[PDB]
Structure 1
């Protein structure tokens, strides 16, 4: 088989035969930030290093054209003082663009073209400085890494709650900080064929969770049990305990989206429960206690379940009794 979403939230889909490369070229910045860190470091390094080299040749060339490279006598004021070779020009380019300015190699007022290049390099230097420094901070401050500290259960549980079967799972937050405006979306991913004969390979049917005022809103500070009540209009209304084997083509996806309180950027944590990762005769064990004047959450027992008496019939059969 294959997993639509990995247990860690990675999506196992490969996009193939794209014939619209122009769209990717028209969207450059998103490409720049989406690069892996070794490529981001290379681009960050090569952006400044090539910029210094490009103007280093310009500084070297105009010093050549002005006769500054020739050591013949003196009495001539160079475009840039103390420039002898390309290495001097390259060092001067670094001083100007990074705004170090040692002053041993200084621009003089003899060559208006040199003053023109000094204006151009500073303007170009600022734009490269602005984009690249901002780009690498966006790369660092991405909110998807915050999703690594949002943990779901390794197993999902279907059991009787208030007389109806409920597909339950537990989601917790390890960090002290909060997830502002957290929303939970649960979907069923399987191949469904309509009566007209249309087949959808990964038809994602959105299932609701019981919240009391609708859904898609939680206050995640202690590990919550997120459960969906299986009723007449639920896609799992005809799910039997015999169906919960490895090769079933039945996947449940849980999505947790919210604004990271520490950073301010919305994140997304995903997980998936295959058919064999759902336990029928089980129930989660409480892990919240009260020590002194502060509730203590025991994350060691996060995913533990305890068998409970549950009917081996489908939710359809339960209504029919």
Structure 2
């Protein structure tokens, strides 16, 4: 419609796949699919797995008792293989007791028939296997940290202002939790339908972008909010963005990828956000945020994304660097 976003502001992407030759890999990764599922759906499969297993073996216990004929009334002329089985519902309760390992012991397993002994072995092994598998799935779900990515907070929209003479595309990212993100990393990409002289056409060319770090690396130590900018050098594809060329249907998008292993669970998480063409404010520096109180600092997240207007030329970066060079040479 108006303009498709590659990744939504909340971090979820919007790309739609089509014409996939389903090889069953979606079904093949049973354990991975369970982890992805929501907790209500996980609990439904959890309940259905146990209930189906309990009911399946309950029918088997009823079947073996019916075949042995020990459920019909008897007077001392018989010894049932599973004691006190005089109804199907008794077999159902017996199945619960075995697999859950409750073992009330009112419905025992006698030494008489060997088939019930084999079925008891099978039910115990199957119960342990399913318990172990559900543990694994629950342990991977309780170790999920995608809900940690939500606590990572970016500015509502980014700016482009002059700093140290040159021009840079600024940005702010914040963390709300008290915990730390070990080995953090901020990638940054521009997504443009970039045409090439040789004749190629790319529907969405993803150009990587440096983080303008001190040592030219991707490492970032994120405790307070930081003005994470990108120096618009000659090679930067943002070198030719006219401020007059900032309107809606300008084919632009600034991906941001904040990575880093969460300290608590030890799981790595991504944070994503895309700045559109009309979501950029030219020449507006960010409001200072990190105040100081008595013996301690103070971050004012109320002013997290407020930007004040600062004067700057309304010229493309090419029209700025070239002009400055000519003036210096003439002088």
- Structure 1 length normalisation: TM-score? 0.97
TM superposition shift of 1:302? 0.3
1:130-141 paired onto structure 2 within 5 Å: 130-141=132-143
Note if contact 2:160-2:282 (Cα within 8 Å) is conserved in structure 1: yes
SS at match of 2:48: helix
TM superposition shift of 1:105? 1.4
Residue 201 of structure 1 corresponds to 203
Note if contact 1:80-1:107 (Cα within 8 Å) is conserved in structure 2: yes
TM superposition shift of 1:23? 2.7
Greater shift in the superposed pair: 176-185 or 141-150: 141-150
TM superposition shift of 1:52? 0.3
Per-residue CA shift, 1:130-154, capped at 9, x if unaligned?
1112212322331111010000000
Aligned structure 1 segments of 4 or more residues deviating by more than 3 angstroms: none
1:29-48 paired onto structure 2 within 5 Å: 29-48=31-50
Per-residue CA shift, 1:203-258, capped at 9, x if unaligned?
11101111111221111111111100101000101011112122111000111111
Note if contact 1:33-1:138 (Cα within 8 Å) is conserved in structure 2: yes
Q: Higher strand proportion, which one?
A: 1
Per-residue CA shift, 1:264-305, capped at 9, x if unaligned?
111111111001111102111111011111111111100010
SS at match of 1:181: strand
TM superposition shift of 1:25? 3.2
C-alpha separation in 2, matches of 1:285 and 1:254: 21
Residue 303 of structure 1 corresponds to 305
Per-residue CA shift, 1:34-53, capped at 9, x if unaligned?
22333222211111110101
Per-residue CA shift, 1:158-178, capped at 9, x if unaligned?
000111111010000000000
TM superposition shift of 1:28? 2.4
Per-residue CA shift, 1:60-80, capped at 9, x if unaligned?
111111112111323422111
Greater shift in the superposed pair: 288-297 or 66-75: 66-75
TM superposition shift of 1:186? 0.2
Q: Which runs of 5+ in 1 are unaligned?
A: none
C-alpha separation in 2, matches of 1:197 and 1:266: 40
Q: Which runs of 5+ in 2 are unaligned?
A: 323-331
Greater shift in the superposed pair: 115-124 or 29-38: 29-38
Per-residue CA shift, 1:116-137, capped at 9, x if unaligned?
1111111111111111122123
C-alpha separation in 2, matches of 1:12 and 1:63: 57
TM superposition shift of 1:319? 1.0
Note if contact 1:6-1:271 (Cα within 8 Å) is conserved in structure 2: yes
Note if contact 1:83-1:89 (Cα within 8 Å) is conserved in structure 2: yes
C-alpha separation in 2, matches of 1:111 and 1:256: 64
Note if contact 1:185-1:216 (Cα within 8 Å) is conserved in structure 2: yes
C-alpha separation in 2, matches of 1:204 and 1:111: 70
TM superposition shift of 1:99? 0.9
Q: Considering only aligned residues, what root-mean-square deviation do their CA atoms show, in Å?
A: 1.2
> Which residue, out of 48, 53, 56, partners 1:54?
56
